Design a protein around this ligand. Structure first.
Ligand SMILES: CN(C)c1ccc(C(=C2C=CC(=[N+](C)C)C=C2)c2ccc(N(C)C)cc2)cc1
Lengths: 186, 186
């Protein structure tokens, strides 16, 4: 495909180098195409990026759907989501580029739109887990939205700032985290 | 002093033009030093910047050393420290040079090592809190080391991925988080 050959290399570079680190010039080189093609489908580099992000938040979200089954209680779904967060190949792998990107476009008021569109998607899994666990008497969360936001970010933190120690260390920490958080809800 | 002069000049250069932009050429001239001297104290730009980072960490600990006197109990110090990490970052001038660096040196073990002894220092503040809260029946963590790494990363996660909310909300969320986390020990 066309837009699909591009997107692949982009995601490739965005992760491997960083937002700016990677440029349109580059993309073309290992993607073969007119420096224009990238203009209809995607409005700009902000687009090509935001697109890749959109896909990823979809893929990962879907994977989770095809795996939460293995968790009978939401308490379990919570521990499980955070754990998978460490192994997946989606979204998280370019949280660094996102950080770059947000600090380099945060000044334009077009950020609070898409960078708030992917927001509700990212914190959704926790929404469901907490909301649904409320209906299932697993706990009693009054401020579900707050807690989802907290959870989502704290975890993204554990996932990101430990990207160097061994994977089993990460999983144990992540698990101790999950343990404590839930124990704090009630 | 001449070495301290370079560290000082380099710091302001980094703040004004970021990490990649700043050249050792400029650093050498504005501090009235030389390539030779710059090479002797630090060996590289990476090395020089990491050195800045260490000095900054020290001032931060020093600051905290004073600021905590305000918080009587360790439950309090926990709350305070997290809020402080959130607010000081809102306006930390090196914050951007940091990101531009960390996202360019996370695949090199040279920098991933020294940047680890650096994070451990940040994790110590927590360690102290928790060890001390123990000796006061404020709580009883049998894995102070682990809980500490968790606290550090959960919090930084909340600090790093939330820039799209008004500072008040951020503060609300971090304090809520501190409540949940501290409660997560009952
Ligand atoms: C986006 N990005 C590349 C980042 C984002 C945040 C940081 C961290 C940080 C830097 C400066 C601070 N102040 C001047 C107050 C406070 C915190 C930090 C994170 C984790 C950590 N630990 C693992 C313990 C220690 C520090 C570093 C890189």
């Amino acid at each position: 495909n066309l837009k699909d050959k591009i997107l692949g290399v982009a995601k490739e570079l965005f992760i491997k180098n960083g937002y700016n680190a990677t440029t349109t010039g580059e993309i073309v080189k290992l993607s073969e195409s007119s420096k224009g093609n990238l203009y209809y489908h995607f409005k700009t580099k902000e687009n090509l990026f935001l697109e890749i992000l959109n896909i990823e938040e979809s893929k990962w979200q879907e994977q989770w759907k095809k795996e939460q089954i293995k968790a009978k209680t939401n308490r379990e779904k919570f521990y499980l989501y955070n754990e998978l967060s460490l192994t997946t190949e989606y979204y998280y792998p370019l949280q660094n580029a996102i950080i770059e990107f947000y600090t380099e476009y945060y000044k334009t008021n077009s950020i609070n739109e898409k960078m708030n569109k992917l927001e509700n998607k990212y914190i959704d899994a926790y929404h469901v887990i907490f909301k649904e666990g409320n209906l299932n008497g697993e706990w009693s969360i009054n401020d579900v939205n707050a807690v989802s936001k907290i959870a989502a970010n704290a975890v993204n933190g554990i996932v990101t700032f430990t990207h160097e120690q061994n994977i089993n260390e990460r999983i144990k920490l992540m698990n101790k985290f999950s343990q404590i958080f839930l124990n704090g809800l009630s």
